Amino acid sequence: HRPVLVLSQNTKRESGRKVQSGNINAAKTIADIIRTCLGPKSMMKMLLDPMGGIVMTNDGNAILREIQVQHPAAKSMIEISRTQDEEVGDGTTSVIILAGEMLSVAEHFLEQQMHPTVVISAYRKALDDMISTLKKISIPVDISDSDMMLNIINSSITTKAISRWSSLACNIALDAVKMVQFEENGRKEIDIKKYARVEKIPGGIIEDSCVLRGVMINKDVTHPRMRRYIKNPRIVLLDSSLEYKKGESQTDIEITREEDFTRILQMEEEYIQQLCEDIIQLKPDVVITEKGISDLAQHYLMRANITAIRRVRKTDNNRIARACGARIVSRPEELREDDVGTGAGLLEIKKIGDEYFTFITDCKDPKACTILLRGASKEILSEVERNLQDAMQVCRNVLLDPQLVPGGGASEMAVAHALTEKSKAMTGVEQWPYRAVAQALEVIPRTLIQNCGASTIRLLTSLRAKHTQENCETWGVNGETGTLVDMKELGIWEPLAVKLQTYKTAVETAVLLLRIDDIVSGHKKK
Amino acid sequence: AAVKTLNPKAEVARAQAALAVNISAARGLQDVLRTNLGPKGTMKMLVSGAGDIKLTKDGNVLLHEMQIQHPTASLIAKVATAQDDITGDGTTSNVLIIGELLKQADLYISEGLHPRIITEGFEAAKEKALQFLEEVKVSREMDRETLIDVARTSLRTKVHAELADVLTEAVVDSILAIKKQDEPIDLFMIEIMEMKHKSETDTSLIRGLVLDHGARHPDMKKRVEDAYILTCNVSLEYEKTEVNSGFFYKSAEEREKLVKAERKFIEDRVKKIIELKRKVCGDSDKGFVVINQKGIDPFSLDALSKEGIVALRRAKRRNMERLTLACGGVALNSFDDLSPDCLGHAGLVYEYTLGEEKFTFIEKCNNPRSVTLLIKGPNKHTLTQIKDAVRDGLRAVKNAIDDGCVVPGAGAVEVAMAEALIKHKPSVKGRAQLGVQAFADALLIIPKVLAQNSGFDLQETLVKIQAEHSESGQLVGVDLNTGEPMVAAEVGVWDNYCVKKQLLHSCTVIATNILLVDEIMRAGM
Amino acid sequence: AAVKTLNPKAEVARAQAALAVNISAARGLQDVLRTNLGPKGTMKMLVSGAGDIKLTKDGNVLLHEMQIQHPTASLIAKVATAQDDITGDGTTSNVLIIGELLKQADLYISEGLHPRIITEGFEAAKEKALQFLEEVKVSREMDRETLIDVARTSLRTKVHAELADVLTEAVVDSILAIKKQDEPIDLFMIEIMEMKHKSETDTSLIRGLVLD
Amino acid sequence: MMPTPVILLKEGTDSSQGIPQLVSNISACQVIAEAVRTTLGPRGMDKLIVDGRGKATISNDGATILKLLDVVHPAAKT
Amino acid sequence: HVPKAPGFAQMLKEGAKHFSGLEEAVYRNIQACKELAQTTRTAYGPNGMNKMVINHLEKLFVTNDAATILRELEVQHPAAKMIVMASHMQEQEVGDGTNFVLVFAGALLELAEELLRIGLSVSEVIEGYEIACRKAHEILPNLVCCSAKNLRDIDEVSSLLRTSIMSKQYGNEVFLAKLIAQACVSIFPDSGHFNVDNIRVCKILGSGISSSSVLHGMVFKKETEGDVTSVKDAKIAVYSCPFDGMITETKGTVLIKTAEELMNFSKGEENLMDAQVKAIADTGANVVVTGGKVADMALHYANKYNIMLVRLNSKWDLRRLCKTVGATALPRLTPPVLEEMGHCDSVYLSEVGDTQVVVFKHEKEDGAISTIVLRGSTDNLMDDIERAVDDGVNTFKVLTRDKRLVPGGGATEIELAKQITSYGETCPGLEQYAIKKFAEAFEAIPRALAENSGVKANEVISKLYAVHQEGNKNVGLDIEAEVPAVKDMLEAGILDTYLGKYWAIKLATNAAVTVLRVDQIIMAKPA
Amino acid sequence: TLAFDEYGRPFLIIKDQDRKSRLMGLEALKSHIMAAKAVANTMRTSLGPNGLDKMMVDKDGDVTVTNDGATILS
Ligand SMILES: Nc1ncnc2c1ncn2[C@@H]1O[C@H](COP(=O)(O)OP(=O)(O)O)[C@@H](O)[C@H]1O
Ligand SMILES: Nc1ncnc2c1ncn2[C@@H]1O[C@H](COP(=O)(O)OP(=O)(O)O)[C@@H](O)[C@H]1O
Ligand SMILES: Nc1ncnc2c1ncn2[C@@H]1O[C@H](COP(=O)(O)OP(=O)(O)O)[C@@H](O)[C@H]1O
Ligand SMILES: [Mg+2]
Ligand SMILES: [Mg+2]
User: Fold this and answer.
1) Which Gene3D superfamilies does the UniProt entry name for this protein (chain E)?
2) Rounded to whole angstroms, how far apart are CA atoms B318 and B212?
3) B47 and B65: one domain?
């Protein structure tokens, strides 16, 4: 069997029109999947996992992460929605539809024997003019007002499944960000993932869900003699163990006398009592560590009236350190008065469904909170958890950038008329791809009427005529009824960081996928 | 489809296709689980792959131990899991509401209407159903005769009414002597032991504790009266140092000196126990029982047997919580502060062997606040009938004590709630008029299934029940013996308030979310 | 099951099982054929195993050339075959009545009642519906302008109403010049020839014969 | 990875396009020209072609050599 | 573990698929027909490229005509077959413009996808296309500027036939126009029906296209079996019976009963065949052409009385010989021919291209039938010129049916794009969007002419609307060189098939409408 | 390369070209001499009056002892 004299074995080669017009159809295919998940009249999409679980959601990020594609240009669009999920909260489904439409009009110019670098150079000139249009139609926000911030977060959850419990979910997501807004040195930061833990418990009703003023964990007391209800405890956080372990050496003891073996067993008990005497000098009430607690340490804390928790997680210790103001120490003989968690409120070991939960609530000024979610099952509680993550991040963008853009179609039509009037002074071959960017922005008011069943001809002709005048400029599409209502009366407002990240990512997705004229597949790596 | 283009091995369901998948699967779980609602339901024999018999008819055990692979059946099984986790009963009636909230909605969605219009009518019907439930609840100040009829309703629907007269005295009298003065009753204080001694109708209520392990020494006393409980957590068996040390000896005479010295720290723990027996005026019988959660070597068992101390070993984690309340002592973790204040007291401590398996009994306590239901079922599958019915009955009386009001029985709630939605049906003033009608007809499946399992007519029974409710003010219900409309508040058929409140909330949200699903697909490969 | 005991390779359906087989298959043929009833219906492209295109939306041609293997779907196809054999139109509307007579009866049989009690009400309703049909019929003495409006209704439900004005003058004028004096009209006297000459909107009525 | 439709193009056919097609046709004619390249001129050799049946045919004519090569290339048949 | 989605309501198929809706059925029928429009877009126009298409029979077809390409491609998409059968109806009706159907209907369905995804459904795009189609048939009689009426001879039709030749044979536009002028005019029926079957193509392998000519007669590919090949009188007796004698029909049996009947049977059969050949030799016949076989005794007396024999195994070629020399095929054995004899001028044989042919060449009476003898270096080249020859004969039948012409080369489609846009702006309804999209489908037809010439189609299509300011109506495309600066079509002489443009617009509109009517597709298992 | 083009297309000229054998080289003349010398070295020992015969076996098993050069090579 002689081998065949080939070059680049077991790989593919593809170039020409089949790659330029092939990556457009892969981008149009993903945009048609989540096209029914943009307006407030959207529907859930039940997904099936390879682990056996079920993800029933309508968010554009959680749908595309559960789809395994084989096309290379289809893998690029999934990473676009992952970028929009980490930057902003409710900036997911809008970018995938917009990048599919900007590539839909880009396929028309590739058939006209136009080079792809001419369309990208017209896309970059159009991208620089969409940023300047949103900054002119913006509005400053009073972040100190409570009722003004409730209208911003209600506009982001009207699409999601928590729009029915809108009066409760807006107060939970607003109080969650304002508690974790911590500033130690001269730098403001909001960490809503490491400190704003969203725990879900199956059972109860959704109306009883509330954000606790403190933290909670699923841990029982180490001994039944310990108190399960302390009014004002002095919580001391530990990191090392309260046991006797082997040192980091090759220690070996030669036992030749009779009194030597009983002495080592007594020195193990005196070493635990020494570190237990060093933690009671500050008179604490609650001792919380991350490693195990031996029964010799449980005895000395029992008669000293100390409630001890055994195996609290490391991420939960960092969260309770911000709520109670304690210091996570790793040495019991180096405890100080500043390391004691004073100011903590009521501590209660409740039981929710045949399982104990340690509640540390009612704090004075906590820097970390825990949202207690209670619902029917774990299926719908994963929906409220994914919606509150999209509700707390849209409040983080206003506190770092208090500017609002009129959403609901009014944002896209205010720039599409600005790109049309600015295209009259182009006078070149880049004028016609510059006009297609303004026509590609029409897919966002197209989607709001296709989801509610309204007409797309009689409405878009009247909506385009409303932006011919420079006075109003804020007329959008009402997804509830289906008519044209001004967004100053409805209250649908989106933040500036959401609309800027939507336009910057949808253009650069079309920049990357238009410079691809060749695809090589079939090689291996290390 | 778009999913077929990206992934060729990914199935999908479209808008009119995924609705027929979820509704027809909800009728599959409805037609199976409707044969066990109420006392007239039939027993289901569930055989696994090994061959063991699981004879039960609870709605949570039926959905978990069923060979079904469907995404719609996995959603209802998760809602049914939380119904049997926080409040016990209400699992069979949970699935039948979801089976009718999707079947009555299919009559309107297939006839031109949109699924979101039906879900807007469910929220407006849930608001009236929640306000009507607070008007029909009866506060009876948690009387001990009221809790019998609450426990009798939950126990009949799981047994053939000969053990329901025995288990009601074992559930009500167990839940009263746990906590007082408006304290939340912990269900971990009740131990459930499975025996095989006499028969299924012999389950008694032990006032103390029943431990499943006996004495591990043949010279110990089997029956001990007027005992002292010493609850320990120390390890009496031989343990070494944490650092690897070993021994080193020169002669053979120094070899036996090290074996005597290595047990000195062990015997110092035993000498603290035998000196406590001499300080409690041991000029009488004066029995001593050490439960001793950690293991004991046979060297210390031989030392305690010569003094007359019964010593058990390898107890549970919650045995140091239940026996501490029952005996009144202190569960110690060391022998440095031994005193008679930490000792317990029981009038009778005896054991019994059932096929080379001893069972330690502790009885005759003053105020135990911890009991043990001693289930003595003949077969292995009959033990699963009583255990799943005791925890169904213990969680029923626990909710009736915590909540201050009692909700009426079989048809006294569901028929009166459906008639309240008819008079408030033109109050929505919009397209959601048919959504309140689909919610009111879905609540009527509870008198329909109970009239069907009892052998009576389905439509002829619902006419006479709704006639007695419209022509009177009494909440009339279903009678599973004669078929005539009888009031449930007078015959002694009650229900829990938190069960009917969550049945209007967990079933409604899971029905409005399923009706808004149109893209059932399987991707990820 | 008893049939599984004697013949182990014989599947069976019980009382509550065989009713769900026939009802779910009747809704399967109902949801397909309801998208082509009337003039505003949608066309269907039927491709066989060879590769020929059969573009039609008649209820008899749809049920015959459909990849379905079901016993309930074969029973409705036998009734739909005799509808297009003796009177022509009325085949698409025939399946929708059967699909609704089993769907409306599903709401009563599943709610406790017996299937035979529903069939007693169908006969009592069919006798009143047959007497009501004899009172609403309109006699117009077979005018040639009446036959235009009769042929316009049946032709518009199978073409896009541009050929329906042409085929009305080719059907009504062909059926009048066959027999007179109250004689039964034989449909074998009209030959149907297929040409390819000009276009679809050029079908004329040859007063004699066309031989192939 | 690009073309995955529900109904394919014709059956399974592959077709080249543009400038890589034309160089594929020119280089194919260069290979079949080597079977008549050494047969030109009085100092040109002959060639021997054996078929599957074992029949040997030694010749130097272009009409005899090219008919026994069994060329299935479309451009090289010209 | 992992669950799956089962069937829902009507999953009763045993391996067949189903399509319903706009995205699964209507949008996929558009994208499948778009691939056929982009396939034949390169081969459209005078600067089109050929395509080596290999069918299932493993033979080679290289051509630039879109009609013969689709007959070899085994297309399996059902909506794609509708645009193939619409192009096949263009070949049966006029024989030219089959590719015009793939560009226009391929652009009609492509622009319909932009209307369904932005707006109106198929109930208004179809009704919008039908209004603009009826208005397109009112501009085409107004765009007629010239006519093929004056001087119907070989001089005027040598220029009026160049448009159908240069679209597939660009370099040979002058030689093939004169060869189609000396063949189509020579078979004129004196104001009657022009039969396109009276022109045959005899492919003779040999030298190039410069040696091709047209012979007034027929050229066969058979032998003589004789030595009388030089015939100058040419009195042809055409027969359809086998020239071997008269045999019976049922069984046939010679019955011998004595020694005299056995000896005289062999000599009596030779004398019977001798009397039949000399019966046609006294009538003046020289060529005896039969359809069946010929025995050895018939060949013995054919060389004795000096008459030529022609074997024609094809029964269709025998009927064409009767219309060539003016004779009648006699089904019986050889009679004395009274008046059904043939009359040619010179019947001879010559080995042209290592092929011994029989030529029935007419010299004086030139017009009875014509045969274009084509020469080529390859057999694949002569099949491509034969398609260009048949496009010249089919264009001559169009000018017989209708003498009107419209200026092609892009001049007609721009004026059709301007008038339909004028009707679209004056329509106060919701169907005016489909009328404006119907005129843009005519805009993409000169776009394919500029993309095949290596010219940028954006600057080409901008100069066409700039010079069409309401009074020119004739400027097309000048594809002779880059930087076009396009000229007039009547001065260049690029105008062809007004009746071809009348049918290709009507067939492509009805093909694109029939695709948009398909909303639900039910296919079977292919086997 | 063989059976592949530089643009990735399959390069097939003649049918079943992978199972063909073609030698032009400088050993094509060398292979003709070494094949003809072994026939001449076989027939060298059967030349002259002292030429030894050869034993030929047919396909059917028949044995014929031949010395003439016509029947040996045939
Ligand atoms: N009441 C409303 N009226 C009109 N439009 C709305 C309304 N509520 C939400 N929308 C629109 O629905 C869109 C939902 O976008 P979304 O999918 O949440 O983006 P992301 O995926 O980034 O979170 C928003 O762009 C907004 O304009
Ligand atoms: N003695 C009784 N008489 C009438 N109805 C009863 C009686 N006992 C139980 N029921 C009815 O049976 C229904 C179901 O009871 P059970 O099976 O215990 O709960 P679930 O069905 O939720 O598991 C209840 O809604 C109740 O109204
Ligand atoms: N000399 C010329 N100058 C410009 N265009 C030409 C010339 N000759 C032909 N054309 C164009 O080439 C095209 C050839 O079309 P063709 O493929 O023959 O259509 P069909 O396939 O219907 O026969 C015509 O539309 C015509 O406009
Ligand atoms: Mg959102
Ligand atoms: Mg042409």
Assistant:
1) GroEL, GroEL-like equatorial domain, TCP-1-like chaperonin intermediate domain
2) 13
3) yes
Question: CB within 5 A of ion ligand 5: which residues?
Answer: E 164, 167
Are residues B373 and B355 part of one domain? no
Q: Write out the residues surrounding ion ligand 4, Cβ under 5 A.
A: A 90, 156, 159
Separation CA A178–CA A87 (nearest Å): 19
At B223, list the tokens. Answer: 């029956």
Q: Do E510 and C200 touch (CB under 8 A)?
A: yes
Residue type at position A358 = T
Which residue out of A448, A483, A486, A501 has the highest number of ligand 1 atoms within 8 Å of its CB and is therefore the one to mutate?
A448
Q: Which ligand is nearest to the CA of B156?
A: 2
Rounded to whole angstroms, the Cα distance separating E248 from B367 reads 132
> Burial of E437 by CB count in 10 Å (0-12 exposed, 13-18 middle, 19+ buried)?
buried
Resolution of this entry in Å?
Answer: 3.2
Question: Which phi and psi (to 5°) does residue A48 adopt?
Answer: -120, 135
Both tokens of residue E162? Answer: 């160049």
Cβ count within 10 A of residue B256: 11
Breaks (C-N over 2.5 A) in chain A follow: none
Into how many domains does chain B fold? 3
Helix pair angle (E411-425, E122-139), 10° resolution? 120
User: Are residues B29 and B108 located together in one domain of the fold?
Assistant: yes
Ligand 1 is surrounded, with C-beta below 6 A, by A 38-40, 60, 84, 90-94, 158-159, 390, 407-408, 448, 476-480, 492
CB atoms within 10 A of CB B250: 8
Q: Cα-flanking dihedrals φ and ψ of residue A332, to 5°? A: -70, -25
Shared domain check, B498 and B361: no
Our CA-based measurement puts residue E41 at a distance from the nearest CA of chain A, in whole angstroms, of: 11
Alpha carbon distance A77, A34 (integer Å): 12
Report the DSSP beta bridge partners of residue E51.
E63
Which active-site residues of A does the annotation give?
Answer: 59, 92-93, 390
Among the listed residues B63, B55, B58, the one whose alpha carbon sits nearest the alpha carbon of residue B25: B63
D-F contacts (CB, under 8 Å): 35
What are the structural domain ranges in chain A? Answer: 1-141+403-526, 142-213+367-402, 214-366
Q: Which of E12, E76, E510 sits opposite C28 (nearest CB)?
A: E12
Q: What is the CATH architecture of E217-401? A: 3-Layer(bba) Sandwich (3.50)
> Is A52 known to sit in a ligand binding site?
no
Which residues 6+ apart lie within 8 Å of B260 measured at CB? Answer: A258
Token duo for residue E51: 């395509």
Q: How far is CA D78 from CA A92, D21, D68, E52, F50, in A?
A: 58, 16, 15, 11, 60
Select from A58, A87, A94 the residue to mutate for testing ligand 1; criterion: most ligand atoms less than 8 Å from CB.
A94
Phi, psi of E518 (to 5 degrees): -75, 110
Distance between CA A403 and CA E247 in Å, rounded? 109
| B358/B221 same-domain check | yes
Of B523, B515, B524, the C-alpha closest to B16 is B515
**Protein residue closest via CA to atom 27 of ligand 3:** E409
Q: Give the whole-angstrom CA distance, residue B47 versus residue B65.
A: 8
Q: How far apart are CA B408 and CA E411, in angstroms?
A: 88
CB-based pocket (< 6 A), ligand 3: E 44-46, 66, 96-100, 163, 166-167, 408-410, 449, 476-477, 479, 494, 504
B91, B229: one domain = no
Phi, psi of E510 (to 5 degrees): -70, -25
